[PDB]
Symmetry: D2
C-alpha cells in the first residue's frame, strides 16, 4: 500500500491517484504555477505542476511519442516545427529526431520549468535544449502566436504540449476556437497541428470544446488516445490537418518515413499508427 | 476536489499506486467464505461490484471490459456453439457470449454463490437476464475442480473464457493461471477451440503477466495479446487469447463486422475496427 | 492497515491534517437545506453523525464530549431549573442536561429538522428518549432568531448550552459566535446564570478560538476555559464557560460529587476529580 | 485539504492521519527502522520512524515535558538518570534541566537516529548530546540493562522513551513484566521509572500489558495522558515509584522544586501536575 509519503494527484474531482514518493528534488512556486520534481516508486522521476504529473521517467515516452510522431510522420516533409509548452524538453527531443527538421522552436511561458528540467530531468530533454536546430523561447504562447501572425511566420507542424484544458488557467486561451484560427494562420498550406485535449472520459465537455475548435478550422481531424499510467487515464490527442490524412498512411509508409528520417522510438511504429487511427476514444457508457 | 470524499473507496492498484474514488452509497457488504464483497455507488463510475477492495465491474465502463474479453475470441471462432466461462460472477461475460446466435450452450462456473446472488439482486444492468437464459447454466464450484471433472467426463468446448480475480492478487484463482491448468484447458477444447483470459496488467505486474503468457504459449500455437483501458480499474487490462487453429490477426474489420451481423451481436464498443486496433497495439511496459 | 479501508471517511481537521477513518456501513445520506448529513458505522468509533464531512458525535466517545459540555456548567449552578440548548441535534446534550433532577424545563433549538429526525431514527443511543421527556421541548429554528424572540418575550434561563457546528467551518452557526450574540445570551439569563459553548480548537484554529473567547469575556465576569480529547474528532475540543455569579474554579471535588448525587446524575466520565483536572489543565497551543 | 505531498501516519489500523508535507530532508533505511526527517505544514519539522511521527517542532515539548518532569519533580533529589530510547535528544534535554542531575545516560539502539537528529533537529537536542553531564551509548537497552545489573549500577530516575509497545518489534522486550523486574534492580531504593505506554483508547490490550508489568514490580503507580496533536492521540504515561507518591505532590511544591532546580518549561507547571494526577485516561466507552 502507498506510503508513508504520498502524492495525491487529482484526476476527475471524484477520483484521484495516491502515489508513493521516495524523494523530493525541488519545490518552486513560480509566478505561473507550483512546480515539484520528485522520485516516485512506480514511475521514477516526475515533473508535477499544480499537483498533476506532467511526465514520468518510466512512461513519458508513451506520451511524447504519441503526441509528436503521428503528426510528423503524416507530414511528408516537416522542416519548421513549433511547439507550445513542452517545458521538460521531451516533445522537442522527439520532434528533432526527424532528419527533415531544419528549425524547431519551443515556447514555454515558465522559465522555472525549463531550468528545473535542465537540472533535474536529463532523461527528458537529453540535450534537446542545446541542439543547433532548436530555439527555446520563454513567453506566453498566445503572445508568441500573435507576434508570428504579425511577422507572417509559417510552420509545417505545430505541436501543442500544454497544461490541461480542464484545469489550467495559464493555458486556457490556447484552447479556444479563436486560437485555432490563429494557429491556422501560422501554418503552411499543407501544415498540421496536434494537441493533447485532456480526457474525453472524465472531461467530455472540455474535450468537446477543443474538438469543435479544431474542426471549425481544419478540414481533416483525427482523434486518438493512449493510456499514460502516471496520469491515471488515456490522454486524448487531436490532430488537425490542412492536406494530408493520417488515416491514409499504411504501417509500411509510416515505417518507411521513420527509417528514412533516422527516427528511433521506444513505442511508435506503423502498426501503432494503424491502431491509433482505428481505436475509438473512451466515453462514459452509462 | 483534490481528495474525493467525504466517503471514499481506496482501490489498490500496484501497491505503490492506489485510486481514491468517491462513494455515494453502500448497498451491501458481505464477508463470503471466499472474499469480501461490496456493492456500492460511485460518483464517477456508477454502481460497482468490489471484491477484496478491487472494482470488478462498474456500470459506466464494464462494457469496455466484457466486450473486449468476449468478442475477439468469439468472433475469431467461425462457429462457437459451446462456451465455458470460469468466473464472471456478475453475469456480464455470460451476457456478452450469449449474444452470439451460434451459441447453443453456455456454462458459467463461479466459486462464490454470494457474488452471483448479490449480482442477481443489485446489478440488473450487468447480467441483463443472462443467468436465466435457457441456453445458459450457472454452476457454483471451484473452476479447478470443474475442469478436472470435465476432463474425466470428456466434455469439450469451442470457446473458454476466463473471467477470474487477478493473477497478481487473488489466492482463490491462483491455481487457474498455471502452465498445468492451461494444459487442462486444452484437454476440454475442440481441436479448433479458443481460450481467452484476462492476465492482470503487464505495466504494474510484469512478472505475473509473463507467467500467464508463458503458460498460454506452452499450450497453444497461436497467442494474441491485447489491452484495453478500464477507467474504474486504474489501468489497461491485459488479455491473452490462445487459439488452436484460427488466427485473430487474420480477420479484417469487414469480416469481423460480417460475423457480428450474421450472429445478431449488438455492442456498445467492439467493432471490426476495434478488433484491428486491439491486434496492432503493443501492450504497455515500464520503459525505464 | 496503514491506509484504513476499503471504504473510508476523510474527515477534515485543520486543512493541513485530515483523519482517514474506515467505514463499515452508510445508513443515511441527506442533503438538507442547511448541510450534508451522513449517518454511518465506523470501525473505530461505532455509529457516527457527520455534518459537512465532520463527525459531530460517535457512539464510542460522544459521552466524553457531551458530559464535558454539560456537567461543569450545570454543576456550577447551584439550582439549574430552566435550560436552553442551541444546536445539539442528535439529542445527547439534552440527554445529559435532563439528568439534573433540579431541571424543570429544557428547550433545545436546532435549525435543521433533518438532523433531529435522522437522529431520532438512527442514533437511539444518543438521545435515549430525551426528545420525548415531558420536561423537554424541541424547537426547529435558527438559534439566532430564537434568542431575539426570547429577548422580546422576556424569557429567562439558568443555563444556556451552545452545542453548534464549529466556529471555524460553519456558515450556519457563524452569527451565534459573535460578541453581539453573547450580549443577547446574557439578556436571556437570570442574574446568576451560566453559559457554556464549544469553541472549536485553540491548537489548529487559534484565531477563531480567540475571537469566541474575547466575545464571551466582553459579556461575562467569570470565564473558564477547558478542553477534552475526543478521539473521533482528531483533537481536544475547547469549551468556554461564562458565568454571572458562580465560579467553577471554586468547586471542590467533594462539592461536585455531592451535587451530582443529590440531583441523581449518573455519568460515565465526569466526576469531582475530572472537574478539578478540567479547571487546572491549560489549553493546547502551537508551541513553536 | 492536505497535499499535494502527504504523510500517511498510521494510528489504529482503522484510523490514520493525512498530513501535508512541505519538504523531505532525509530518508535513511537503518538496520533497525526506516527514518525520515521532514517538514510538515501543521507541526513543522518531524522525525518519523516506520511511518510514525516521534516528535514534531510545534508539539514535542508537550510530549517530552510530560514524560520527564512529573517523574523528576516527584523524586526529591534525582542525581543519576537513565534514558532508554529518546534518540532525538529532547528527553535528555528535559532531564538535564534539573540542576540536581550529575549524570544522565541515554541509550538508543540506533546510531542513525542520533546522528540525523544531531544534523537536522537542533531544536530537539539543543546541545544536550554534548552536555558534560550526559553520556550517549549506542546499544539495545535490553543488553544495557543486563550489563548494568551485572555491574551493580544504580539510578534515581529511569525514563523510557521508546517506540510504541503496540507496533515496535525492536522495543518489544523492554515492555515485559520481566524487563520491569530488571529495571527495579538498577534503581535506588527510592527510585522512579516512567514510560510512555502507547494509547489506552486505541490499544487497550497493549496498554494493559505494560500497566500490569509496572504494577507487578512497583508499589506506587500513576497513570496520566496528554494529547499530542502530531501523533493523533493522547499518549499514555505510566510512572512507577518505590517510595515517593506523585499524587502527594502539590502544585506549589512542584513549582518550588522546578524553581530551585532552575527548570524552565513551556508547559509543565504545578497546576498541570495536579490535572495529570486527576484526569482519568480515555477508554472506548461503548
Ligand atoms: C510540462 S508540459 C506543459 C507546459 O505548458 C506550459 N504552458 C502553460 N500555459 C502556457 C502558455 N499559455 N504558453 C506557453 N506555455 C504554457 C507550462 O509552463 C508547462 O511547462
Ligand atoms: C466478478 S468476476 C471474477 C470472479 O471470479 C471468481 N473466482 C475466483 N476464483 C475462482 C475459482 N478458482 N473458480 C471459479 N470462480 C472464481 C470470483 O468469485 C469472481 O466472481
Ligand atoms: C450535531 S450538534 C451541532 C448542531 O448545530 C446545529 N446548528 C448549526 N447552526 C445552527 C443555528 N444557527 N441555529 C441552531 N442550530 C444550529 C446543527 O444543525 C447541528 O445539528
Ligand atoms: C525517537 S524516540 C524512540 C527511540 O527508541 C529507540 N529504540 C527502539 N527500540 C529500542 C531498544 N530496544 N533499545 C534502545 N533504543 C530503542 C529508537 O531507536 C528511537 O530512536
Ligand atoms: N496528470 C495529468 N493530468 N497530466 C496532464 C499532463 C499533460 C500535459 N503535458 C505535459 C507533458 C509534458 N511533455
Ligand atoms: N480493479 C481491478 N484491478 N480489477 C481487476 C479486474 C477484475 C477481473 N475480472 C472481473 C471482471 C468482471 N466480470
Ligand atoms: N471537527 C469536528 N469533528 N468537530 C465536530 C465538533 C462537534 C460540534 N457539535 C457538537 C457535536 C454533537 N453533539
Ligand atoms: N504513534 C505515534 N505517532 N507515536 C509516536 C510515539 C513516540 C514514542 N517515543 C518517541 C518520542 C520522541 N522522543
Amino acid at each position: 500500500v502507498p506510503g508513508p509519503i504520498t502524492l495525491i494527484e487529482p484526476l476527475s474531482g471524484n477520483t484521484s491517484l495516491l502515489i508513493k514518493i521516495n524523494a523530493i528534488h525541488s519545490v518552486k512556486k513560480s509566478p505561473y504555477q507550483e512546480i515539484i520534481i520528485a522520485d516516485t516508486e512506480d514511475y521514477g522521476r516526475v515533473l508535477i505542476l499544480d499537483d498533476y504529473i506532467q511526465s514520468s521517467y518510466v512512461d513519458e515516452q508513451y506520451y511524447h511519442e504519441s503526441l509528436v510522431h503521428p503528426a510528423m510522420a503524416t507530414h511528408p516533409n516537416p522542416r519548421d516545427v513549433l511547439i507550445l509548452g513542452g517545458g521538460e524538453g521531451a516533445t522537442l527531443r522527439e520532434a528533432l529526431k526527424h532528419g527533415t527538421v531544419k528549425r524547431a522552436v519551443m515556447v514555454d511561458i515558465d522559465r522555472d520549468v525549463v531550468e528545473l528540467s535542465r537540472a533535474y530531468l536529463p532523461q527528458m530533454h537529453q540535450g534537446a535544449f542545446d541542439d543547433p536546430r532548436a530555439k527555446v523561447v520563454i513567453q506566453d504562447g498566445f503572445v508568441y502566436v500573435e507576434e508570428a501572425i504579425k511577422a507572417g511566420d509559417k510552420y509545417d507542424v505545430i505541436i501543442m504540449d500544454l497544461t490541461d484544458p480542464y484545469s489550467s488557467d495559464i493555458a486556457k486561451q490556447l484552447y479556444t476556437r479563436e486560437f485555432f484560427a490563429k494557429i491556422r494562420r501560422i501554418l503552411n498550406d499543407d501544415g498540421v497541428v496536434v494537441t493533447q485535449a485532456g480526457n474525453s472520459f472524465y472531461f467530455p465537455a472540455e474535450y468537446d470544446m477543443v474538438l469543435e475548435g479544431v474542426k471549425a478550422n481544419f478540414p481533416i481531424v483525427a482523434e486518438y488516445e493512449v493510456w499514460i499510467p502516471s496520469f491515471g487515464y488515456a490522454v486524448n490527442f487531436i490532430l488537425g490537418s490542412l492536406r494530408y490524412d493520417p488515416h491514409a498512411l499504411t504501417p509500411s509508409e509510416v515505417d518507411e518515413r521513420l527509417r528514412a528520417r533516422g527516427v528511433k522510438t521506444a513505442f511508435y511504429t506503423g502498426r501503432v499508427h494503424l491502431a491509433l487511427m482505428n481505436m475509438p476514444i473512451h466515453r462514459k457508457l452509462r
